[PDB]
Ligand binder design. Structure first.
Ligand SMILES: Nc1ncnc2c1ncn2[C@@H]1O[C@H](COP(=O)(O)OP(=O)(O)O)[C@@H](O)[C@H]1O
Ligand SMILES: [Mg+2]
Length: 538
């Protein structure tokens, strides 16, 4: 029939008597006020645009909670879509236009036109990041509030712009909220809409300068990454859509030329074959694009000395290690939301703490992939210089580089690691000359065994996927690197003692190996406190 969490226009008590009406209705034995929008296929907001706006409302509520209005699908009495709903956000006072009045109580206009310091007290960075995460184009004052956001009819700008009139880059993650590569039309930092109108836009521009605002931005990005439990989000979306198919053919009701625009511009997403498949599978496959994109930017971020606006940003491997409270807060916020807005929901669509832990374990592991690729690449490069000085034919081995951190085809972290296909003890022993042992001949054989074992241990631990990622796997990884360091660190740097730049090059590889063999210990990281980690570095 019609979805479980869908309503019917006949079930709505209008409080008045786009086409926005004020509405109330009954839910779980209590009334819930809301705002009603009616489908207008001939004035934008078609069926599949309205159908995407309700999925966005759910996606956002998973990591924002009550700060993102939940939307519903409303049908007529004959099971035909007619509009969408948007349950009122408790404590929504919206933002002012420069043409509207300026309240005379300073405590009431700090809610309508907020001061940059009051935005940090009310955690508005979490909201602005969510809009940027899903490429929102309508970040104009009335769609934003000091306690949440409500309007989603202009989300997924890269795929939805055609019914009105993804590339999240590291450069935007650095100087956020001053987005510039990702170009919205309305944004709080903008002074003039279309810059790449708020009465005081500079109040939002300063959030990129304040360091406390950047910590809230990181805590927001980590919430988006860790709350993502797809196994439930698929179940919860079917509560709002059921077996509804994608059905992009409904664009014919608006104009057949638009359907032709979509099947020609996006052939891999909305075609004859996908048009009959569930709308859930379509937008989930569409959401994972944004997730993998935000995952590449944040989890692999390696730091910055100065944003374009004043604050230095740490590498996420250091931010997670130095501040273990980030994860401890997401776990507390999850249990809170489990007994808050999910109290009446079933156990099978609640935050699973165990799954949330493995997710953080992944983000922990993958957040270190760069500094372990770097050590393996530095360890590779030094094995070549030794193979040049010891081999008869001055053999230099080629290194297949791994995919860059911003390549849009990158999903898991193990693809960041380069490989040396011919680096094997069985393949290098015959290449050595019995005429060039300055102790460099014994160093090559050692540094080959070292780099092989190193890469082998990284592989076994980085190929474990999230569903098979045991906290013991991180112990195995750490217990071997510490065994690797203790077995080769002395013998190798004793065999390079007589060299100059060649020895110092292995000093940095060993020093880094020791440091990040301990910083990466996950079981030990979960027992730390922000203050314990602030005094352990001095
Ligand atoms: N859940 C909600 N809570 C509070 N106000 C809302 C909600 N949904 C809509 N509104 C009101 O409706 C207006 C936005 O309606 P909508 O049609 O969704 O966006 P737009 O009008 O920009 O297309 C805002 O001015 C807002 O005050
Ligand atoms: Mg709108």
């Amino acid at each position: 029939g019609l979805p479980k969490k869908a309503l019917k226009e006949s079930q709505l008590q209008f409080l008045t008597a786009h086409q926005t009406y004020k509405v109330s209705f009954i839910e779980n034995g209590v009334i819930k006020n809301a705002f009603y929008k009616k489908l207008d296929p001939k004035n934008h907001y078609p069926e599949l645009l309205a159908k995407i706006s309700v999925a966005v409302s759910l996606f956002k509520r998973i990591f924002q909670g009550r700060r993102s209005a939940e939307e519903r699908l409303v049908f007529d009495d004959e099971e035909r879509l007619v509009g969408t709903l948007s349950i009122s956000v408790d404590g929504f006072k919206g933002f002012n236009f420069h043409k509207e009045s300026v309240p005379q109580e300073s405590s009431a206009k700090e809610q309508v036109i907020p001061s940059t310091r009051t935005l940090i007290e009310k955690s508005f960075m979490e909201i602005l990041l969510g809009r940027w995460f899903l490429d929102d184009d309508d970040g104009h004052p009335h769609n934003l509030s000091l306690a949440g956001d409500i309007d989603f009819d202009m989300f997924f700008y890269w795929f939805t712009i055609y019914m009105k009139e993804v590339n999240l880059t590291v450069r935007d993650w650095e100087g956020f909220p001053n987005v510039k590569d990702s170009k919205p039309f309305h944004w709080p930092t903008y002074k003039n809409p279309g810059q790449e109108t708020y009465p005081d836009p500079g109040q939002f521009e300063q959030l990129a300068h304040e360091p406390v605002a950047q910590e809230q931005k990181f805590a927001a990005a980590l919430k988006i990454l860790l709350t993502y439990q797809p196994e439930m989000i698929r179940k919860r979306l079917t509560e709002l859509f059921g077996e509804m198919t994608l059905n992009y053919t409904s664009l014919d009701e608006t104009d057949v030329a638009l359907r032709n625009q979509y099947e020609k511009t996006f052939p891999h997403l909305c075609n004859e074959n996908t048009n009959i498949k569930p709308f859930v599978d379509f937008i989930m496959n569409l959401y994972q694009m944004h997730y993998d994109n935000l995952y590449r930017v944040v989890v692999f971020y390696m730091g910055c000395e100065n944003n374009g606006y004043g604050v230095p940003l740490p590498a996420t491997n250091s931010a997670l290690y130095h501040k273990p409270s980030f994860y401890k807060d997401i776990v507390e916020w999850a249990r809170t939301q489990n007994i808050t807005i999910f109290s009446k929901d079933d156990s099978s669509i609640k935050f699973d703490e165990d799954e949330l832990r493995r997710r953080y374990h992944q983000v922990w592991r993958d957040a270190y992939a760069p500094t372990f690729r770097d050590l393996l690449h530095d360890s590779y490069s030094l094995t070549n210089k030794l193979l040049q000085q010891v081999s008869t034919f001055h053999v230099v081995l080629d290194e297949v580089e791994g995919k860059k951190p911003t390549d849009d085809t990158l999903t898991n972290a193990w693809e960041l690691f380069g490989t040396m296909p011919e680096l094997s003890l069985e393949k290098i022993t015959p290449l050595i000359s019995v005429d060039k042992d300055s102790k460099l001949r014994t160093a090559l054989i050692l540094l080959v065994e070292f780099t092989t074992q190193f890469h082998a241990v990284a592989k076994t631990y980085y190929q474990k996927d999230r569903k098979d990622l045991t906290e013991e796997d991180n112990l195995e990884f750490s217990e071997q690197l510490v065994q690797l360091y203790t077995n080769y660190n002395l013998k190798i740097r004793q065999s390079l003692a007589h060299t100059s730049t060649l020895a110092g090059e292995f000093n940095r590889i060993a020093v880094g190996l020791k440091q990040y063999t301990e910083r990466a210990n996950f079981q030990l990281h979960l027992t730390t406190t922000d203050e314990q980690m602030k005094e352990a570095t001095v």
